[PDB]
Amino acid sequence: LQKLNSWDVFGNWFDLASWIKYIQR
């Protein structure tokens, strides 16, 4: 099944949400 993997953890090095908001502005 779909579990917590290293791609997820490696992704936790970046805060994409905050900067996607910078884009929506």
Epitope: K3, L4, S6, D8, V9, F10, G11, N12, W13, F14, D15, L16, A17, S18
Partner: antibody
Framework: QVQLQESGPGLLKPSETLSLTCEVS?????????WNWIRQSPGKGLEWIGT????????ASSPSLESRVIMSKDPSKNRFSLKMTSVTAADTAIYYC???????????????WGPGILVSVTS | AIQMTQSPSSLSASVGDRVTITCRAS??????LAWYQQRPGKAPRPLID???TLESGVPSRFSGSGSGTEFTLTISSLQPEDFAIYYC?????????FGPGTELEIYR
């Protein structure tokens, strides 16, 4: 020196919903950390329930409680929270908030714990 | 999930004895194994991580070893304050699981 402090009410009614919040006092919620909640009952034992990533916001729970557990994080107030529903009294336990540092590709131990919060479900 | 077991669930010794808890896992979880000490009342305290690397503030007498299925926590000389409950926990994969716990008490 990261310091975790649980909050929320320890007075609950059966088949309902509790809400706990962990104030972080050493690092930003929106960091390369993983904010976890841990459950400890004498018979049910020391059980991991949930986690959320400070940056990615990716959420993960225990197969048993994923169906009735919810994770959240408020960086503006530098806290993270969890809320479990259908609160059978068997869930009555101590709830700690912990965190995991991480390497490039995986998590680490629970290096820091909160004092623990006693939430009981009964009238 | 990953079945985490621990032996013995109970054990009694006295100051000066080399005591040893053992921790077993369903699968080969490499070195992703940590040990916590919980003196009843307060919250768990991490002692070992990566199976054989002890946290800050951990007395040197404590030791860990293992790299796969079965690991060992090893106190090289018991002390008045070591009479706590010891949990082993894997973080190799989720759901993250703990061992049953291992009791450690005094005499008389």
């Amino acid at each position: 020196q990261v310091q975790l402090q649980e909050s929320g009410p320890g007075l609950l009614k059966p088949s309902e919903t509790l809400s706990l919040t962990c104030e972080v006092s050493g690092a930003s919620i929106s960091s390369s950390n993983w904010w976890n909640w841990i459950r400890q009952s004498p018979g049910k034992g020391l059980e991991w329930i949930g986690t959320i990533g400070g940056n990615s916001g990716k959420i993960a729970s225990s197969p048993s409680l994923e169906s009735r557990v919810i994770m959240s994080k408020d960086p503006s107030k530098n806290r993270f929270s969890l809320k479990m529903t259908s609160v059978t009294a068997a869930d009555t336990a101590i709830y700690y908030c912990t965190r995991q540092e991480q390497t490039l590709f995986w998590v680490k131990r629970f290096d820091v714990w909160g004092p623990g919060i006693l939430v009981s479900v009964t009238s | 999930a990953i079945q985490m077991t621990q032996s013995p669930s109970s054990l009694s010794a006295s100051v000066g004895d080399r005591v040893t808890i053992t921790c077993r896992a369903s699968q080969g979880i490499s070195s992703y194994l940590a040990w916590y000490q919980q003196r009843p009342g307060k919250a768990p305290r991490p002692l070992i991580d990566s199976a054989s690397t002890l946290e800050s503030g951990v007395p040197s007498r404590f030791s860990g070893s293992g790299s796969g299925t079965e690991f060992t926590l090893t106190i090289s000389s018991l002390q008045p304050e070591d009479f706590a409950i010891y949990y082993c926990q894997q973080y190799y994969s989720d759901p993250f699981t703990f061992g049953p716990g291992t009791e450690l008490e005094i005499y008389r």
